[PDB]
From a paper:
The Clp protease system is important for maintaining proteostasis in bacteria. It consists of ClpP serine proteases and an AAA+ Clp-ATPase such as ClpC1. The hexameric ATPase ClpC1 utilizes the energy of ATP binding and hydrolysis to engage, unfold, and translocate substrates into the proteolytic chamber of homo- or hetero-tetradecameric ClpP for degradation. Here, we present cryo-EM structures of the substrate-bound ClpC1:shClpP1P2 from Streptomyces hawaiiensis, and shClpP1P2 in complex with ADEP1, a natural compound produced by S. hawaiiensis and known to cause over-activation and dysregulation of the ClpP proteolytic core chamber.
Removal of the N-terminal flexible regions (first 29 residues removed in shClpP1 and first 49 residues removed in shClpP2) improved solubility of the expressed recombinant proteins. Since the truncated proteins yielded poor homogeneity in the assembly of shClpP1P2, single mutations of the conserved catalytic residue (S113A in shClpP1 and S131A in shClpP2) were further introduced to stabilize the stacked ring structure by attenuation of the complex activity. The two proteins were separately purified and in vitro assembled into the shClpP1P2 complex for cryo-EM analysis. The reconstruction of the assembled shClpP1P2 chamber was obtained at a resolution of 2.88 Å with an imposed C7 symmetry. However, the free shClpP1P2 particles resulted in a C7 symmetric reconstruction at an overall resolution of 2.34 Å. Since there is almost no difference between the two shClpP1P2 reconstructions that were obtained above from two data sets (RMSD ~0.594 Å), the reconstruction with a better resolution was used for the following structure determination and analysis. The assembled shClpP1P2 chamber is likely in the active extended conformation, consisting of two heptameric stacking rings that are formed by shClpP1 and shClpP2, respectively. Numerous hydrogen bonds and salt bridges were detected within the interfaces between the adjacent protomers of shClpP1 and shClpP2, accounting for the inter- and intra-ring stabilization. In the apo form of shClpP1P2, the hydrophobic cleft is covered by the C-terminus of shClpP1/P2, which may protect the complex against the hydrophilic environment. Our results show that shClpP1 can only form a heptameric ring structure, and the handle domain specialty of shClpP1 may prohibit it from forming a homo-tetradecameric structure.
Author numbering:
A (entry chain E), D (entry chain F), F (entry chain G), G (entry chain A), I (entry chain D), J (entry chain C): 31 to 212
B (entry chain M), C (entry chain N), E (entry chain H), H (entry chain I), K (entry chain L): 52 to 227
């Protein structure tokens, strides 16, 4: 009731909220909203991220859609931006990635559950390794760090403050008041 | 209990799924029979669909470790892990009943939730163990390693005469 | 327990559905009875609704291996796996009580979730098993394979005299 | 509230979303949507696929409906297109099948679960064999590969990248920018 | 426990619902007591609410097959399946206590889901079982076929004197 | 949200969907829809069937309603038409029964589960036999085959392809393109 | 929902549906609909019955309401009219009780469950006997058969075909086409 | 356990709810104690809240059929069925401990779902059962039929002295 | 129906309610409402708090959003304000934090649940200690107390009355009548 | 459906209902309704109470809001007014507390469930004692009785009739007909 | 039970997960066997997937407190907690069968439900526990402490010969 109404009134101003674990449904909704807002190709889109992570394919779909449209996408980190949500936050257009002063950013490596015969398990393990390598490459591309350091740090979780994230390259600026957002 | 009475006639049963407890019981029985005079054979009857694999290996090297011969008799069915133990008896002393069925196939597992590194390590161990089981089965049979690799990829089911021809058993007994 | 006392009298009971544990127990009793003097008959009473088909064949093979004969007495109800074991006794020594009923029907199974190849292999094995049971029942009776195939498609329930006429039972006993 | 609104607004632009396992309900819904959009006889239809597969009969109904209507259908793979969803993606009109750069495609052979007597199991096993052969034939027809290659390749699970899928024949092009699609 | 002590006194207790396990136990005791001298009677006390119909028939056939006489006394209550066994004792040797009650009624079943052919076969066998049970009860009583068929249409509860008059029992014992 | 709007806009064009197991609820709904569309007695009604079958009485009510109204009923088989759904598919007006090229038709004999005393079981078994005979006779009437052939063929499960179904007599034509229906 | 809409239009014309077990809720909704349609004391009311029966008191309330209002009530049996649904179907105004050609009708006697002390069981058993006698009397009144015949027939379940129901007196006519009802 | 030792002392316990198993056990104990010298009394201690009717009547009929005297001692509590058994001992040999409490009330049941005819038959059965219990209680007490009917309409609770005055017991024992 | 309309009118009056445990959903909703009400740069926002607290990251998001917008936020403590709720109540703009006369306030140190290997547990324990230190610093900044006093008081649970909270520095004033409300 | 509508009309008539156990949800709704109705500061507010009571904090928030607004509150006791509901009923403005003739008023003492170490349990027990003392003080203030009598009387459960409650001081009058309310 | 007979031969089985009950049994058996002649050795066979650390430490301390030598035979598999106990035998008397697998990895836990202070205390405890276990394992092997730091960061699985080379196992036995 109230939530749908306030979210519609916010979407009327080109603002998208991603505030739950990333599964197929939420990724489908975010892709639909981005495609809908892509009708006007000269106005930017703001995405607010407070998520603990989620699935890999759904996040890949969201990332591809973000890189697909002509409109620039401004990513804002509020609260928690962990696991693949961090990847989506770092995937915004350069110069337009921000985080609030008391936000937490976490870097993680993929996890999966496998069951079947040895050949099927071999195939799925190879695919999981390929997915991990792809995520490492994309993170290295988006933050500017070398692919070696990202591998080392993603090994076991690494938590980052706003200023630490800005120094690392995950975000571009830390905002305090409303003068900073474009 | 008839099981103890048959124990006095050095007869051991494997009639359940292979697990840690059953494997422990089987090795305890084998060690107890070995502690007796080492000049009498041990007869083991197998009717099992398989089970845990490390427990199977424990039973296997327990049989390979003791001095007296172990005679394996197929019964009802001997599938997967049970087939490995049936073919592990001493040469010339592996037998099957006329209406028993034998099945062989590759190991199955479920590498649980973990990081990429953990899944890599577990999958490497699983591939190693599949190779080890295939080599072990190749040594106990007349067939080469490549043929055993080819025939294990899917489920293959053999009868008594087919098992005799293939090499999983030595003879099929119809009467005493 | 009266079961041990009847064991001293060479009497074996099959009053539950055929499973792995029951079949293991039954053949243990059979081997124990065969271990002593082989010039005495064994009496098996069957009151069972059927069960697993591998344990079925385990008990059947044990019955056809021992030298001592196994007289089989029908009991209350003998269906499916019970009927084949009842007809598997030594010729001239298969009996039924006057008010017992016998049922024969084709095997049932559930080919579990798997790929197309696995289901193909399992279905081929199921057809082979059904044909083997058909032939086995045909040999122990007087009827040919085609007639047993025709009568096995659906459930067929026979009384004592009907079973005597068909060939599943050699005689019906009323008193001792 | 939000999802229904954005989906209706997108359907007004002739865009259909298939972002869940394929069952009777979703197949019925996509068939109904295609039938309605068939009222306008010369405008194309876009289908976005992010699904892990589903039931055989429902997917065959969707395939037959897509091949039925006069309008061309453009299939787009975002995220995951696995098992029968891959078959639906490859079933689009020639020259109008694309995938995103991080799209990820899987080819899978059918699976089923049966119970009953020996005769019923025999009948159902024969039907499953027939279904597998039909799917292999349709995939061979749509992808331009020989039937033997498809049969051998689909025995296990094979995973495809966007460029590998393009070379294989499942799709015709890989998007990077909105200017690359009609 | 007192059950074995009473077994030495050749009395048998049936105080549970008739099932496969209970019927197996009861006829095992009957055969055991047969194994002793065949010139001593056996006493059976029946306090049961009914049970399965094949196990009932197994116990009945064992009682009719075993040589020495079987004494049946009613025990608190004797429902449908218990009534058949109570009336199955040797003529002139069926008794009841003054405050025990007897119930007779037609069989009940749950024909499982299946094709129309299977339902037809099962229903035909059900009708045959009903007719056979009514005929068996009519032979053990003075009342004819028509009266018995009429009376088990619904539940009919009889007291001790009513049971004696109808023919279910032979006498009512108030003291030793 | 979506499904109601799509189905309403389709029913506005005299399209009825039967895409779930046949029970009392959707049989009641289909009877209501047929009665409503019966207001105009000159236009035909199209019924789309994708169902695995269901209860006997509900399907019989649907059949009687279809034979009741004056408007002709055209039936389309898409996906699966099995058990009682096959009976409804072949119950359409002669010359107006079609199936899609990849549709599967299944003929199946009735099944039921009873409980109670012997007399009640006898009565219910007689009623089940009566229903089986009625279904065989109605299928023979609507198909053109003899009653004996239908009785022998329905003992087990027989699967039919579209062309096999057309040859058998359950359907009249196989649907390929939009020029088919009037 | 679509079902709500079609039911609204059907009730608007004049139709009332009863297609589920008779409980307190559906009896209340049937009584409300009858009371509202009683606004115009001249036009008739149509009631369609497809139900396996239900609670005795709710059906008694429905029967009393049908016998109360001045408008004539036409009863139509489609599919199953069993247990107390048969009683409701036979309770329509004389000359306006019909059934479809394949409509199947069952006559049943009441059943109940009881618990408590031996003094309460006596009262509840007497009340159950009174209810059974009342139902037998009402059925004898409405079908024209003698009370003894009705009691003897309802002692055990009897199943009725449409023509057998007409001969027995439960209904007045069997319709086949749209020209048979007012 | 002390239960066997008390068995050697001719002491029987009823300290649970009345049920088929407990009634069968108590009856076995009573018959076994009959097998001993028939000139020695039997002591039964009752601490029970009641239970099923038929088991109660079985125990009552055993006590009335057993030849030696059965002395009953109420201890803890004796309600419903337990009150019937406590008052059913031989006259002059029914006792209760000073702080025990006794309760009497009418039978309770739940006539399950069924047709009207079945419920009519069961209700008549219940009324007959209630009348029979009233008559039995009136026989064992000094009170007439009408008074016993009036008192058991609802729960009436009596202490030891009140029970002695009413007639449910014969004496209150404090110290041996 | 009722339960959303009154909230909508209150939001139209610039009143926000926070009366359930703070989680991701409600933090997202409160952030959306604050962003919407920020459309007018010059009107204050009143927030009513009756909650037992909740997740730390959600409270951080709400706190950052409250400190973000240009409009002053007036916090009213009603009922219970414990753990995170107390921190949010004390986070209002200076001179505009209030509580009702019977309002009850609790100060409580963070708690969490961990699982995994020793290294992961070490990392998460360090992060939890960092979070506790940050909360102590923010509370000391807002209430004007020293760090040592706050970190000593929060070791156990301390309960505050309205006047005790005012003396401590958590709130600014306690009213009894609507005259004193800004 | 119906309930929301009738409650909306009653709220338009300045009537508030409290007919469920008092918990945070119902307490936030009633406080919202009171704040909304406080827009017009000259019309009275009527509150009907039929509740068994609930949590102390929620009821205390309701009490504070009732004492907060400028409008007079008239409390009507109907059905049951127990525990905290009695406290709210007695909290109305003097001279405007009423009860129906067959109303029931129950005075109860607080109960709670505690767990934890022996140092936390001490704090929570002290807080519970403080809450009980505050409740007794407020009840004594609103009833006119001495604190000692209230403390003695609420040790166990005491039930009150309407006239007994009026004599005790919890209500001001007992009403029968429509001339009672001002 | 063969376990008692093996107890007579001074062999101890550890074939389940390490828990409080299993550790209690094992250390009770070790104390018992210490009570007899202190010059005979003790044989322990380990096939365990590991378990609790405190029970592990109890067994380890009992092993080093008991005077006669304890020889350990790796078998089937020896996971983390099993590896520590397996390597805890007396030097020169630690053995493994040819097909056994050995796994070592760091401790795991759930320092979870709690405030900040409790989690801090538990985390310091866990770090101390890990350091102590690693130091203990380093003393029983030839490798330095830093190598063990690096090696149990993730799972590392060793075969029989690899275990011999590393230092976990003294010698690998193929036959007696």
């Amino acid at each position: 009731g109230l939530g749908d109404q306030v979210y519609n009134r916010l979407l009327n101003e080109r603002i998208i909220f991603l505030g739950q674990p990333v599964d197929d449904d939420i990724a489908n909704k975010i892709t639909a909203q981005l495609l809908l807002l892509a009708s006007d190709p000269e106005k930017d889109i703001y995405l607010y991220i407070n998520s603990p992570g989620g699935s890999i394919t759904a996040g890949m779909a969201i990332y591809d859609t973000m890189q697909y449209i002509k409109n620039d996408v401004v990513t804002i980190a509020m609260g928690l931006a962990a696991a693949m949500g961090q990847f989506l936050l770092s995937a915004g257009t350069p110069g337009k990635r921000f985080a609030l002063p008391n936000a937490e950013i976490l870097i993680h490596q993929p996890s999966a559950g496998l069951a079947g015969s040895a050949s099927d398990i071999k195939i799925h393990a190879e695919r999981l390794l390929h997915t991990k390598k792809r995520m490492a490459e994309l993170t290295s591309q988006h933050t500017g760090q070398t692919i070696e350091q990202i591998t080392r740090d993603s090994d076991r979780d690494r938590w980052f403050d706003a200023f630490e994230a800005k120094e690392y390259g995950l975000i571009d600026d830390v905002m305090t008041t409303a003068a900073g957002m474009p | 209990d008839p099981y103890a009475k048959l124990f006095e006639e050095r007869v051991i049963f494997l009639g359940v799924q292979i697990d840690d407890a059953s494997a422990n019981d089987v090795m305890a029985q084998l060690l107890c029979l070995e502690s007796m005079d080492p000049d009498r054979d041990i007869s083991v009857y197998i009717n099992s669909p398989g089970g845990s694999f490390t427990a199977l290996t424990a039973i296997y090297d327990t049989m390979q470790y003791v001095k007296p011969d172990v005679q394996t008799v197929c019964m009802g069915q001997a599938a997967a892990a049970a087939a490995v133990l049936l073919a592990a008896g001493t040469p010339g002393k592996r037998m099957a009943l006329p209406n028993a069925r034998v099945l062989i196939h590759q190991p199955y597992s479920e590498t649980g939730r973990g990081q990429v590194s953990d899944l890599e390590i577990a999958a490497n161990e699983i591939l190693r163990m599949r190779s080890q089981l295939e080599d072990m089965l190749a040594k106990h049979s007349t067939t080469p390693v490549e043929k055993i690799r080819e025939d294990i990829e899917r489920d293959k089911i053999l009868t008594a005469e087919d098992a005799l021809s293939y090499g999983l058993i030595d003879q099929v007994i119809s009467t005493r």
